[PDB]
Each structure stands twice: as structure tokens, then as C-alpha cells.
Amino acid sequence: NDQLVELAKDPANWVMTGRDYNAQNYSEMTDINKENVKQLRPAWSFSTGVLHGHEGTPLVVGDRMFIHTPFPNTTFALDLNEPGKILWQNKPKQNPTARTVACCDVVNRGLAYWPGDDQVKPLIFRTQLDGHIVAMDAETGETRWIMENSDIKVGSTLTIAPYVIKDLVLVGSSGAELGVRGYVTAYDVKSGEMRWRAFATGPDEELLLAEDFNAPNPHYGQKNLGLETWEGDAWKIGGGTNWGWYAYDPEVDLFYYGSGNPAPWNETMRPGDNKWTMAIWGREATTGEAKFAYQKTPHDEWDYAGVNVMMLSEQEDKQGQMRKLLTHPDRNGIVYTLDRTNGDLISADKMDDTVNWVKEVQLDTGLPVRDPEFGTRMDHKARDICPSAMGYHNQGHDSYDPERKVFMLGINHICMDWEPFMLPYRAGQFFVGATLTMYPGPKGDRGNASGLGQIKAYDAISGEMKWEKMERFSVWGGTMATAGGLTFYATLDGFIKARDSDTGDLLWKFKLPSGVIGHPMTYKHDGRQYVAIMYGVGGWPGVGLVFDLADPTAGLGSVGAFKRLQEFTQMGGGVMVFSLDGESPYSDPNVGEYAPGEPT
Amino acid sequence: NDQLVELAKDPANWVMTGRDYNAQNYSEMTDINKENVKQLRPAWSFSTGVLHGHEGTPLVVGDRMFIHTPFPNTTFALDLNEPGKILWQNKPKQNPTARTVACCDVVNRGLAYWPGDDQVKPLIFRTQLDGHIVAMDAETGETRWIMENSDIKVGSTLTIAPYVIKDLVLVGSSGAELGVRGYVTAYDVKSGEMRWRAFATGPDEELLLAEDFNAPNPHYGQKNLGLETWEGDAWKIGGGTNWGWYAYDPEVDLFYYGSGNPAPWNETMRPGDNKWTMAIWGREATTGEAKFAYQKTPHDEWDYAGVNVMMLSEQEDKQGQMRKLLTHPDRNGIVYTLDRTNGDLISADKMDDTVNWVKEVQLDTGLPVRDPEFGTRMDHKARDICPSAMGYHNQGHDSYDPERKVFMLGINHICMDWEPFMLPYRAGQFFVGATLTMYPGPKGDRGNASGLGQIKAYDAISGEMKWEKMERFSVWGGTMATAGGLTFYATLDGFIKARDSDTGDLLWKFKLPSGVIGHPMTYKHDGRQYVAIMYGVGGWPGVGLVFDLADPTAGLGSVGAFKRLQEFTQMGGGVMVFSLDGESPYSDPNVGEYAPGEPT
Amino acid sequence: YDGTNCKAPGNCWEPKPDYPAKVEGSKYDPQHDPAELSKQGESLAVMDARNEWRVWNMKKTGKFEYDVKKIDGYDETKAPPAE
Amino acid sequence: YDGTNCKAPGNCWEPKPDYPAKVEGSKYDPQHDPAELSKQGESLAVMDARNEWRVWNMKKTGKFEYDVKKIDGYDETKAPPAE
Ligand SMILES: O=C(O)c1cc(C(=O)O)c2c(n1)C(=O)C(=O)c1cc(C(=O)O)[nH]c1-2
Ligand SMILES: O=C(O)c1cc(C(=O)O)c2c(n1)C(=O)C(=O)c1cc(C(=O)O)[nH]c1-2
Ligand SMILES: [Ca+2]
Ligand SMILES: [Ca+2]
């Protein structure tokens, strides 16, 4: 959508997940910088009325901030002129059974916005856990349409944030732990009429491939690999769901995203490279046809679901030429960079030397050289594999500083013990088939279950780490960088931190009500620069805390790794907003005060 | 307790509900005052991880802050040296059936603290909705003992905060809407052994009266009134439960508290004065024997439960006689002042001229001249009664400024339509018997349903209202006054405000995550004065929002009166602390950061 | 009924115009079931009962137990041992 | 199985030492009931079907309706009118 890129040029709004189509979570504003970040204070706050994981970030368009929530996923609209008033709220009615088939908490990653045209005013889009995608008028919040995308009767839910391109709203999918075959779908923003749908496994007509799919890199694989890499009909239940993020290049009209892990976790029950799970996609937006696809993890064996953030940038080649790129910090521990117009493999570095499932990735063949000593297989218990299923990087939406040309990566430092087991597939039931035991990586404190995270500034071309810092817990919510030389992010233990982008020094922080798992956002209102972030620990890291568990292997093996978390935070939910000296529309006490008049 | 009156002398501690036995919610500190107040910013915050109404106020004792919460009532302890750490938490296992017999949300008003002695260490006391009273080691949070005080099987729950005097802890009672006969019980802080117990209705022996009960004021009534002001055995389910607050004068060794309303609400079903419900009590802390008692509302007809706050002061009569007083702003819309040693009725004014169930309170007889046009009775729908069942004043624990000699009162402006109906009493089932329609008083906007609160500075002796200010919502959570000329209080629409104690002007306010129903508090730590408060709307005014009610008569009639509350706030739960420029232990970014290994 | 006409000190209730002086035997007679009106008291008795053993056991053992079923010497129909 | 010996472009899987090249027949045979493997596809089919009716009704009526049961002319076995 052209108007959306136009609206993104104004520091006034944050119209989509990663702020703009390049998904960089970067702001050109310098009001808040290294010099004055010490004076950053809370301007106002808002509780969502619901607990559980609060992922994603709010959207700002003019004098309005849009807030999504975890189950029952009610959407709120706040008046920025006086954040105290709630313009509107759309609260749906869902079958609480949907909560039953959610693998990793009832989270939701965000909303989407369509600029509207001369026929239909601006619309806000939301996805619901129960499988529905819905459109609502942005002014009043009243529902325009609703369509069914995923059936919870088969363990198919929705947690991903909808994404708008031109006149299409994209809807991903969740449920690989339930054996759901992954698929992305495009609906018309106005009618909600399905324009196309593309699966991650099976025949090439369901895979939706362009006549010249993977032509620039034939070795990546091309035709009929959707069936050929699976034994029998196993692909009908082979995951591949995309619940991560998107990116889009309007110039070549290609949006990018990653397909998830194959089902079940038991690798012995599914021989083959299981394509096209664990792949990076380059799909034509209007038609949905794939121009290229690169499988990062052939025949997965660790649940390295490849749905992570896709950050776009234009940097200089290692041979000295300007290349249009795509950087992607994967769950398997590798940070991939490709020519986003080719699928050309340019960089594939380990985010931490401790990654041991792979010795290295060959840039000429693109194949990862597995280290047999760390794979998984029936009748065997692999140990100290890194990364763990939670990966060295999860759902967190990171950022890129176009000026310093570095990526601010929120990393996880977790490894695991893994032993699979046989199990039948019953639609609607779980189809995992593996027992885990997770804990801190070699650089952490496995003795005390601490030191499970890291944040680093990475250079895609040189593959060098400008600076690295250890965090007590995994930095799960992503990051945001600004022209002010600051890199914001939040922690699971309750803080929003601001670091020096050049040195990685901690310049400021605040103790929010609860841990964070969403990414920071920034907008400008009434000539003032605000920084907002959501809080409310949850997601996979918090299932133990959230669902009061004690078995260390419970929560797909996450409960153990995070048993200490509860000593630093409890559940929560809301959005906290900051500014210099806590300046807000309420600095003048009277603003908002009751005056007999009419409805406030 | 003596050392308790001592710790109270140090501005670093807030050891009990109203800080000290005089229960004035007054601060001697001036760091924050009429000047700097505008530079007050959030220093840190904590999420309780639970929802629903958050009443009461946190207790601080040295380097620790204790926090109570609504069902499941789990207790927390924070390290003030670095608030991000949770020293300990005690989470009980209660029968969820308790929620079933709670009339007005599953709230809890506070904790109690016992300084400990050479035998046993300091103790933290809590009450649980399921009727248990429990002691815990204030250093580890380990349970010492738990006793059964209330039975939910008969509709008897606990919401009131425990109270410590000498080596005893007082436990109140809740359940009048379920026909529960009220009674206060005292236990040994160490053994948890029951010392005494006094009921509010029935025979003098169970009432526990002193040999000279009311000798000073015989006209108040004396022997056998708890049996003669009732027909037959009606008193066996009369109510009079005390769930408000206490006050204590160790000089005369007497504590004070107000007894609740009589059951049912259908007045026609219980003819008689209904003593001793709706009374002010003066009992010996060691025996529990009453020295005096005054019934403010004989034969209740409006649910003006007389359990409100008891603020002790030492002022001068109108005859120039220095008297140890007690001011009490009751639900009936009258604020009373008696001699806390004698029982003499010094003052009894109308908190607002709209009160119409009474003409006036004759100071000589001590009787409320009723106005038949505003009473209730079977087969009659009374209209426009003020105050409403919620009263012109509720559970909010207010404050008194010794120096300015005034009382900062948080008032409600709600009237109502009332209609009784016959119904059987069934142990464990609701026993109300009345349909109500509440709405804004005459001084508010009844068309738009706004303007239901007021904040006024009241002088007891002169009976004057220094200043008055109107709020769009009932100021429901009490107030706090400081030596700096400031009076803090929070609103239901989610703000914590500070007004000029002399002019009542609004000098500052902050938009908290959710509305407030508890009172603010302050303490000095690390040489810095902080102002903490709890947010999380709920309680009676919020039952409609918390339980999703749409019928205007639902919520005992509160739903219709607060139907607009939903446009200003959602549920929440936590505590937020403030200070000048929000300085805090974390002003040094590196405090509490991950510092593994042996640094030094 | 203005509340001033007191039958005696501390007792000033008077039937409102057109209402009985005694509800028993009137169209307003609540007719409460005594069996029901006594449940509260019975409930307090059992709790105090159980609580007695909780206080005793902790003194005699130095440890505290809530579940009376796990106290040595407990008996529903019997008070604690004089010790 | 190091992942570098490909049977063809994009196909580099090999059984680990001692493990079958085909699970069918081996002791690791999943034996997926075909009835089960079909639930998903069937589901998408019925949802897409209902969506067509939803889309059709808003276009013809002018107002939106989610519950197909309340759509004038809704027939579970047929697709909306070819118009
Ligand atoms: O198989 C799937 O489709 C799927 C879905 C989701 C989801 O929608 O939350 C997660 C996962 N897998 C997953 O493997 C995982 O690690 C995970 C973490 C989270 C989170 O929000 O913290 N969601 C998910
Ligand atoms: O008579 C009782 O025992 C009883 C108990 C309580 C309670 O437990 O808080 C309330 C009430 N009554 C009551 O009438 C009322 O107005 C009320 C308001 C609230 C609140 O916390 O906002 N609780 C209660
Ligand atoms: Ca997964
Ligand atoms: Ca009551």
C-alpha cells in the first residue's frame, strides 16, 4: 500500500508491526538521545484488563493509539489527546476451548492498518485465537467483516499479527505442535474475500510457485519437493505454519516470511528434508506465487521453528557493491542474510560460538553441515544441544540502525536434553512426541538457572559483533533503535532498558509492573517524542509462572529453564508510555478534570 | 502494642492501616510539598499478577514493603533496596466457592504487623476471603499458624484487614447480605489462640458489655437492647458485621470500630431499633468488653452500614474543653464526633446538604429525626433517597491534618430508588430483599451519569467545609494528608491526584494503569520520601465492569450508576511508587543488573 | 415514625402508618425456619472446636498442623487433653 | 548423515546409522490413519464454503452477517447464486 509507506515517512505514526515495510523498528527522531535519556520518565499508562502474555506493540495513527490484547483479544482505541479516555473497544465472544489448543500461551502479536480510500474509511485488522480474522472501522471500532481462517477443532489457532499490503491483509497460521499443516492466506481488505492461499508442504499447486521458482539458485531445490521430501502422506500433517513476521519490498513487489517446523518433533517419524518447512520465502504479493525459497533447516530435529523476524536493508556488498538485503536471526542459532531479490545466500553466521548442532553453513551450497553428535533420534537421549527448542532467538521483533549499519539482536542462551517417543496423530490433540529439559547455555549459570539471555549489535557483512551483553533472562521481546544513538528493549524480569548503540552501555532503565515480551515503539505527538511499550510476562518463557507448574519438563520443557523467573515478576498487562520528564497532556492537571458539561 | 506506637514515630515506617493507632493517614514529612509536588514522577512499579479490586494500602517496615491482594489473597514482600526483587510470597489454596458468597467483589483491605519480642520474631497477618486468619514470619513469609474465623458455607467471608494491639490481632466479619450475625474476634499473635469474641446482636453476654456499659450516656441505651430491639429470634441473622477499620488509644486501652447494617435489607421483616447494628464501639482491648456504644442509624432502612473509618484526634470543644476525640464519616451521610473515652456526642453534621433521610441529629437525645417521605417499606417504591445504599461515604480510609485541624473526606454523591420484597433466609444464600436504582445526586449530572464524588476539607468542631471539590466519580479509596500542605487521593477513572490542603486546588496528577479504590501512603527510605498507591478498579462501584453486568438494577443497583466507568478504565492490579523526579535505587542503571562471578 | 417517640431509653421504634406492631401473624411474617436460623451458631462451634486442637497440638509438638485429621489424638466429639 | 550427500538438488536426507530408509514396515512406522490425515483439509473446505456465503450476502444485502444460518437463502450443500 502506497499510502501506508507515505504515512510511515511521518514520525507521527507507527502504522505496522516493524513501523514500516522494511521492518527495521528504527526511528529518525533524536529528541531522546544519549545525552538526555537519563531524564526519561513515565508520561501515562493503561491497563488492558487482562492477564497473560502481552506481545507485539501498539499502533499509532494521528491522535489514536490502537491496542491489541491476548485472549479474548479485545481491541482498544485510545485518544492520544487525553489517553485517559477510551475511544472504543471491540470485545469478541470466543469458544474458550480455543485456549486448549494453544501451545505456548494465549498471546497475540499485533494489529494492522489499512489507510482507506474513496469508498471505505481506514480499517484496523485483528486476528483472534479462535481462528477468525476481522476488520473494524478505525474511527468507531465497529466490525466490518469476519472470516474463518483456522479451525480450532484440529488444533489450528491464530496468534500472528495480520499484515496489510496494497489491498490485501495477510493471515498466517499456528498449530504445528498439533500437526497443523501451515498456510498463509490473503483477503481483500474491503470484502474479506479470499484472493489466494499458499501452503508450506505438499503439491506445487498448493505451494503456489512461480513458473521460474528458485531459478537463480536451482540447487536450493525446485519442483515437486513438497511431496518428494516426505515419505507418503506425512506432509498432510507436517507443520510449516508461519506465525512470525513479514517484510515487503514494493519495488519488486515481494513480501518475505518464514515457514515453521515440521510435525511431529519426533524426527524418526518423518524421513526427508520435509520441505518446505523451515524456509525463507520470497512471494509475489498480488498473486502469492513464490519467486524463491531457501530451507534453513532441512529435516528439523530441534523445533527450530523458522518464523523469526525479517529485517530489510540496503548495504554494501562484501565485494563493494550496494545490495538489497534481508537479515534474519533464526531459531537454529544462525543469522541469515540474503539478496532479497534473488534468494542469494550472502551471510550465515552463528549468533554465538556455542551453537553446536551445526559445524557451519556453506555459502556455495547453502547446506548446513550437521554434527551427528547433536541431532535427535528415537531410542536415544541427546544432551547439551544448543540452541534448545526455544532457540537462541525467538519471536522477538528486532531492529536495524541504517546509520551504524548494525542489527540489535535480542538473543536467548538456552540449551537442552532431548529424547523423542512414538505417538499417534489425532486431529485436535497434541502431536509433539518428545521430552525436553532446558537450561542456561555454557556462558550462563546452569547452576542457578540464570544468565539465559544476550543482546548484541551485529554487522551482516563483516559478520562481526560490535558489542555483546549478558542478560539475566532471555531477551524475548525484540528491540528498537533510534537516531539518538539509543537501542531500547525490555526484559522478562521487568525492565525497559536503553543502551548506547555504539558501546552497548546501560544508560537508563525503569521497573515496569511486569516482565516484557513485546517490542518498544516510538511516535511523536504534540511536538513531543514518546516511547511506549507493553508489559505482561507470558509466552513460552512464562507458562510455568502463568499456569503454576512445577514439573521441569512441563511446558514443553520451558518450566525448568525459567523456574527462577517468578522471583522477579508476576503476571500483568498494560502499556506504559514514556517521555522526557514525564511530560504529557496531563502536565496541566486540569486537562480532563470533570466539568458538568456533557459526556467526557 | 508499645514498640508499634514507637516504630510509628519514625517516618520510615507505615506499620498499620492508618499508619498509627490514631489512624489519620497523615505524614510529618515535608520533602514533597506545595512547591515540588509537580516534579513527582513514578520511581518504580509492581504488578500483583491478579485482577479485581485492589483496596487497602501497602505496609512498609524498614527495608521491606508488604503487599496484600484480592482472592487468592497471596501476600508479597519486596526488597526496598531494589524493588525488582520479591523476597517472598505466600500463596494460599482456597476453595473457589468463597467467591460465590462475596457480595461486592473479592477484595481485601490490608495486612497487620506485630513487632515481635524476645521469644518470637516479627509477624505479618492476613485475612482470606474463605474466612481464615493467618500469621507469617515477616522475614521468610513462612506460615506460623492459621485459624478458622468465618465459614463460607453460611455466607461468612473475610475482607477486612487484621489489626494488632498488644499481643492480640483483631479479626472482623463480612456477610450481612447473606444474613450473617456480626462479630469481632481477638487472637494471641503467637499461639493464634482465641482470647475473646463479641457479637453485635443478641444477649448482653455475647455482646460482651462492661459492667458499666454506657454509664456516661444512659440515653444511648443499656442492657438487653440486643434482644429487645428485635422481634423473636430475628437477631440470629441480624448482621452488624464489622468489615471497616479500627482506631486505638493505648492511654485508656480502648479500640474503636463501627458495626455493620442489619439483615435483611427489607426493613419490614425486622421491626425494632435492631441494636447493636449501625453503632460506634468503644471496647477494652484486653477483654473486648464495651465501655460505650452509640447507634447512629437505629432500624436501618437504607443499608447505611456503619463500618466506616475512625479518625482519632485531640481537639477543643466549643466550651473550650480539651477532648480526646474520634471523627466518623458514616454512610448515612453524617460525620460523627464523640469523646473516645467518654462516648459523648460532640458533633454530628451532614457531609452534604442533599442528605434527606434525616432532618437532623439532636445532639441532646442523640437521635436522628427521620423524614417518613424518605424511609422504605413493603409495597412502596421510595424515590430520590440520599445517600444511596452505597452511602455518601464508603470503605475509603480518609485522613486528618493535625496542624490545619481538618479532615480530608473522600465522598460519594449517589442517591437511589428503593423497593423491598419478601424472601426466605437460607444459610449460605443471599438474604437482601430489595431492588434498587442508583444514580448521581442532585449536584451531579443524572442525564449523562457523571459526577458521583466529592472531596471536602471538614472542620469537626466548627462543622465547616473549608473547601469543596467535585469529582466525576465517587472518590472511593480514602485520602492521605502530609505536612507539606498536600492531600493525595486517587480516583476510579485511574488517577492519583494531589490537592492544596488549604485551597483544595489541583497541583498534580498521574494517569495510573487502572482506577483506584485503596488509599495512598508515604514513607522515607534511603533518605528519599516515596508515595505509593494501589491501582486496580473493583469493589462495589466496579462489580459491573469486573463481572460484565448490563442490567441497571444488577450489582445491587450499582451497575446503572457506574455504567460510564468502563469508558475511563479497565481492570488491573499492582502498586506504583513516586518520588521527586522519580529518583529511586535504579537511578543507577547498573543496580540490580546481571553481575555474575565474583566482581569486587 | 420520626424516631423520637421512645418506648424506653435506647428503644424508639414505632410501626409506620398502616403496619403491624408485631410482624408475626401478619402478611409480613417472615416465618423463619428455626433449623435454618441456628446453622450459624453450630458452624462457629465446630470451627472453635477444630481450632482448639490446632492450638494444643502446636504447643505440645512445637510444629503447627491445620488438618486436624493429621493430629495425634484428635477426636471430633471431644475437647483437647488438659495439658 | 551430515546433510551434504544429496540424492538431488534440495534432497539431501539420509537415514542415520542403523535407521531405516523407509519407516513403513520398520518399528518406527507411524501408521497414520488416512481418516485422520484428512480432517484438516475437510475443515478448510467447510470454512471456505461458509465464507463464500458470508461474502455473497454482504454484497447482495449491503450489511454483513457472520452466522450463515441467518443468511437468506443459505444452503449448506450448494454455493451462492452465480451472479
Ligand atoms: O507450531 C506453531 O504453529 C507454533 C505457534 C506458536 C504461537 O502461535 O504462539 C508458537 C510456536 N509454534 C513455538 O514453537 C514457540 O516456540 C512459541 C513461542 C511463542 C510465544 O509467543 O512466546 N509462541 C510459539
Ligand atoms: O455487610 C457486609 O458484611 C458487607 C461486606 C462487604 C465487603 O466484604 O467488602 C461490603 C458490604 N457489606 C457492603 O454493603 C458494601 O457497600 C461494600 C462495598 C465494598 C467495597 O469494597 O467496595 N464492600 C462492601
Ligand atoms: Ca513449534
Ligand atoms: Ca453490607
> What is the DSSP code string of A547-567?
TT---TTHHHHHHHHTTTGGG
Helix (H) or strand (E) holding D49, with range, is helix D39-61
Cell of A443: 556462558
Question: Looking at the partner chain, which of C16, C40, C48 has a beta carbon nearest the beta carbon of B427?
Answer: C40
Cell reading at A17: 508491526
| Contact yes or no for B66/B77 (Cβ under 8 A) | yes
A232 in reach of chain D (CB within 8 A): yes
Q: Which residue has the cell 480526646?
A: B324
Nearest to B587 by CA among B42, B153, B26: B42
Q: Reduced to 3 states, what is the DSSP secondary structure of residue C25?
A: coil
DSSP state of A140: T
Question: Mutating which of A120, A144, A151 best tests the D interface, going by the most D Cβ atoms within 10 A?
Answer: A151
Sheet of strand B183-188: strand arrangement: B163-165, B168-171, B183-188, B194-199
Dihedral of the alpha carbons of B460, B464, B469, B473, in degrees to the nearest 10: 50
CA proximity to A559, closest of A449, A448, A477: A449
Residues in chain B: 600
Task: Cell numbers for B589, please give them.
Answer: 542503571
Helix (H, G, I), strand (E, B) or coil at D81: coil
The DSSP 8-state label assigned to residue B9 in this structure reads T
**Which residues are bridge partners to B156 per DSSP?**
none
Inter-chain CB proximity A582 and B582 less than 8 Å: yes
Strands A479-482 and A26-27 turn out to be: parallel
Residue with cell 500469621: B135
Q: Return the SS3 of B63.
A: coil
Q: Which residue among the candidates B20, B31, B130, B303 is catalytic per the annotation?
A: B303
Q: Which among A340, A316, A187 is positioned nearest to A257, based on CA atoms?
A: A340
- Is B598 annotated as a binding-site member? no
Neighbouring C-alpha atoms within 13 Å toward the C-beta of B179: 29
Q: Which three three-digit cell numbers place residue B47?
A: 504488578
Query: Which of 103-132 (A) contact D at CB < 8 A?
Result: none
Is there a contact between B540 and B412 (Cβ–Cβ < 8 Å)? no
Choice among A130, A303, A330, A349 that is catalytic: A303
Nearest to C33 by CA among B155, B233, B271, B265: B233
Biggest alpha carbon–alpha carbon distance for chain B: 81
Ligand nearest to the CA of A389: 1
Contacts of B195 (CB under 8 A, 6+ apart): B168, B186, B187, B188, B288
Q: Tell me the Ramachandran region of residue B36: left when phi exceeds 0, alpha when psi lies from -120 to 50, beta otherwise.
A: alpha
Atom in ligand 1 nearest the alpha carbon of residue A541: 22
Reading the block at residue B284, the C-alpha cell is 477494652
Measuring CA to CA, which residue among A547, A446, A422 is closest to residue A53? A547
Asked if B330 and B305 touch (Cβ cutoff 8 Å), the reply is no
Query: 3-class DSSP state for residue A377?
Result: coil
Sign, CA torsion B531/B534/B540/B545:
positive
CA–CA separation, A326 vs B145, rounded Å? Answer: 62
Closest to B86 in 3D by CA, of B128, B49, B135, B40: B49
B388 lines ligand 2 (CB under 6 A): no
Which residue's C-alpha cell is 499502533? A59
Place of cell 445491587: B556
Tell me whether residue A342 is exposed, middle or buried, using C-beta atoms within 10 angstroms of its C-beta: 0 to 12, 13 to 18, 19 or more: middle
Q: How far is residue B575 from each of residues A581, B11, B127, measured CA to CA in Å?
A: 21, 20, 20
Please choose, from the candidates B539, B565, B549, B554, the residue with its C-alpha nearest in 3D space to the C-alpha of residue B70: B539
* Beta strands B480-482; B26-27: pairing state: parallel
Q: Which of A286, A332, A285 is nearest to A308 (CA)?
A: A332
Is domain B1-600 annotated with CATH 1.10.3720.10?
A: no
Cis peptide leading into B42, omega within 30 of 0? Answer: no
Reading the block at residue B202, the C-alpha cell is: 443478641
Q: From chain A, pick out residues whose CB is under 8 angstroms from the CB of B567.
A: 85-86, 600
- Which pairing describes strands B254-258 and B279-284: parallel, antiparallel, or unpaired? antiparallel
Q: Do B51 and A51 touch (CB under 8 A)?
A: yes
Cα–Cα distance measured from residue A210 to residue A254, given in angstroms and rounded to the nearest whole number: 12
Pick left, alpha or beta for residue A494 (phi over 0 → left; psi -120 to 50 → alpha; otherwise beta): left
Grid coordinates belonging to A220 = 536450493
Inter-chain touch C34–B229, beta carbons under 8 Å: no
CA distance B453 to A551: 50
How far is Cα of residue A461 from the mean position of the Cα atoms in its chain? 23
A367/D4 CB distance under 8 A? yes
Does an H or E element contain B579, and which? strand B574-580
- CA atoms B230, B236, B239, B241: torsion sign: positive
The closest alpha carbon to B179, from B151, B152, B156, B150, belongs to: B156
A177 is in an annotated binding site: yes
Count CA atoms within 13 Å of residue A424 on its CB side.
8
Task: Give the alpha-carbon dihedral of B286, B292, B296, B297, to 10 degrees.
Answer: 80
Could you confirm whether A339 is annotated as catalytic?
no
Grouping H, G, I as helix, E, B as strand and the rest as coil, residue A267 is helix
Residue B572's identity, in one-letter code, is G
Alpha-carbon distance B452 to B476, whole Å?
A: 10
Helical spans, DSSP H, in B487-546: 539-546
User: Under DSSP, is residue B559 helix (H, G, I), strand (E, B) or coil?
Assistant: helix
Q: For residues B225 and B290, give the distance between their C-alpha atoms in angstroms, rounded to a whole number.
A: 14
Which cell is B278 given? 449501625
Given CB atoms, is A174 within the 8 Å cutoff of chain D? no
CA angle, B221 then B222 then B224, to 5° = 110
Q: Find out whether B551 and B10 touch, Cβ atoms under 8 Å.
A: no
β-pair partners for B59: B66
SS3 (DSSP) at A374: helix
Q: Which three cell numbers stand for residue D15?
A: 537415514
Cis peptide before A264 (omega within 30 of 0): yes
Beta strands B414-420 and B465-471, pairing class: unpaired
> Which 8-state DSSP code applies to residue B472?
S
Cα–Cα dist B535/B159, whole Å: 17
Q: How far is B38 from chain A (nearest CA, A)?
A: 8
- Tell me if chain C has a CB within 8 Å of the CB of B96: no
N- to C-terminal Cα separation, chain C? 58
What is the Cα–Cα distance from A358 to A350, expressed in whole angstroms?
9
With beta carbons less than 8 A apart as the criterion, state whether A88 and A76 touch.
yes
Q: With beta carbons less than 8 A apart as the criterion, state whether D16 and A377 touch.
A: yes
Residue type at position B82 = E
For B202, the enclosing helix (H) or strand (E) is none
Q: How far apart are CA A322 and CA B481, in angstroms?
A: 65
User: C-alpha grid cell for residue A223?
Assistant: 519442483
What is the β-pairing status of strands B528-535 and B521-525? Answer: antiparallel
What is the C-alpha separation between B410 and B518, in angstroms, rounded?
11
Phi, psi of B402 (to 5 degrees): -55, -45
The cell numbers describing B499, all together, are 490537592
Rounded distance between C-alpha atoms, residue A176 and residue B137, angstroms: 47
* 3-class DSSP state of A578: strand
A52 grid coordinates: 497473560
CA distance C14 to B577: 53
With an 8 Å Cβ cutoff, are B372 and C16 in contact? yes
Give strand pairing partners of A457: A408, A467
To 10 degrees, the CA torsion angle through A22, A28, A32, A36?
Answer: 120
Q: Give one DSSP letter per residue of A73-136, joined into a string.
A: --EEEEETTSTTSEEEEE-----GGGGGG-SS-S-----EEE---SSS--EEEEE-TTSEEEEE
Buried b (16+ CB within 10 A) or exposed e, B441-462: beebbeeebbbbbbbbbbbbbe
B596 contacts: CB under 8 Å, gap ≥ 6: A445, A450, A451, A470
CA distances from D31 to A3, A427, A435, B362 (A): 52, 14, 21, 90
Give, in degrees to the nearest 5, the angle at Cα A288 between A282 and A292. 25
Instruction: Report d(CA B389, CA B559) in Å as an integer.
Output: 13
* Calpha distance B187→B566 (Å, rounded): 42
The residue assigned the cell 535519556 is A37
How far apart, in whole angstroms, are the C-alpha atoms of residue B386 and residue B416?
7
- In ligand 1, the atom with minimum distance to the C-alpha of A390 is 16
C28 → closest Cβ in B219, B221, B378: B378
The three cell numbers of residue B405 are 485541624
Taking alpha carbons only, the member of B265, B309, B579, B561 closest to residue B431 is B265
| Domain count along chain C | 1
DSSP class of residue B361? Answer: E
Residue entry with cell 543469522: A335
Q: Let me know: does A377 contact D19? Beta carbons within 8 Å.
A: yes
Distance (angstroms) between ligand 4 centre and the Cα of B303 equals: 7
CA distance A490 to A57: 12
Q: List, in order, residues 6 or more apart from B396 with CB less than 8 Å away.
A: B309, B410, B475, B476, B477, B478, B479, B517, B519
Residue carrying C-alpha cell 472531596: B455
Neighbours of B60 (CB within 10 A): 24
Three-state secondary structure call for residue A599: coil
Q: What is the largest CA-CA distance in chain C?
A: 65
Cα first-last separation, chain A:
36
Report d(CA A286, CA A168) in Å as an integer.
Answer: 8
CA dist A537 and A146 (Å) reads: 29
Q: Which residues contact C67 (CB under 8 A, 6 or more apart)?
A: none
SS3 B523: strand
> By what technique were these coordinates determined?
X-ray
Please list every residue in chain C followed by a chain break, i.e. its C lies more than 2.5 Å from the next written N: none
User: To which H or E segment does residue A150 belong?
Assistant: none
**Minimal CA–CA distance to A127: which of A108, A154, A153?**
A108
Half-sphere exposure of B477 (CA within 13 A, CB side): 35
Distances B33 to B11, B29, B38, B527 between C-alpha atoms, Å = 15, 9, 9, 16
Sign of CA dihedral B278, B284, B289, B293: negative
Say which of B147, B232, B378 has its CB closest to residue C24: B232
> Do residues A220 and A294 touch, judged by C-beta distance below 8 A?
yes
Q: CA-to-CA distance for B122 and D82, rounded, in angstroms?
A: 81
Coil, helix or strand at residue A37: helix
- Grouping H, G, I as helix, E, B as strand and the rest as coil, residue B239 is strand
Which of these, A403, A503, A389, lies nearest to A28 by C-alpha position?
A403
Q: Which residue has the cell 416465618?
A: C31
Q: In residues, how long is chain A?
A: 600
- DSSP class per residue in A194-227: EEEEEESSS-HHHHTB-TTTT-S-GGG--TTHHH
CA–CA gap between residue A239 and residue A101 (Å, rounded): 15
Smallest Cα–Cα separation from A536: which of A40, A50, A41? A50
Q: How far apart are the first and last CA of chain B?
A: 43
Work out the end-to-end distance of chain D between its first and last CA atoms, rounded to an integer number of angstroms. Answer: 57
Q: How many residues does chain C have?
A: 83
Strand pairing partners for B335?
B329, B349
Residue C22 belongs to what domain range?
1-83
Phi then psi for B178, rounded to 5 degrees?
A: -115, 15
Grid coordinates in use for A168? Answer: 490485501
DSSP state of B450: B
What CATH code is carried by the domain that includes residue D83?
A: 4.10.160.10
- Residue B356 CA, chain-centre distance (Å), reads 24
Angle between helices A539-546 and A554-561 (to 10 degrees): 90
Per DSSP, B20 falls in state: S
| Binding pocket residue ranges, ligand 1, CB within 6 Å | A 55, 103-105, 107, 159, 174-177, 239, 241, 243, 260, 303, 305, 394-395, 539-540
The length of chain D is 83
C16 close contact with B: CB closer than 8 A: yes
User: What is the distance of C-alpha A512 from the center of its chain?
Assistant: 22
Q: Whose CA is nearest to atom 9 of ligand 1?
A: A104
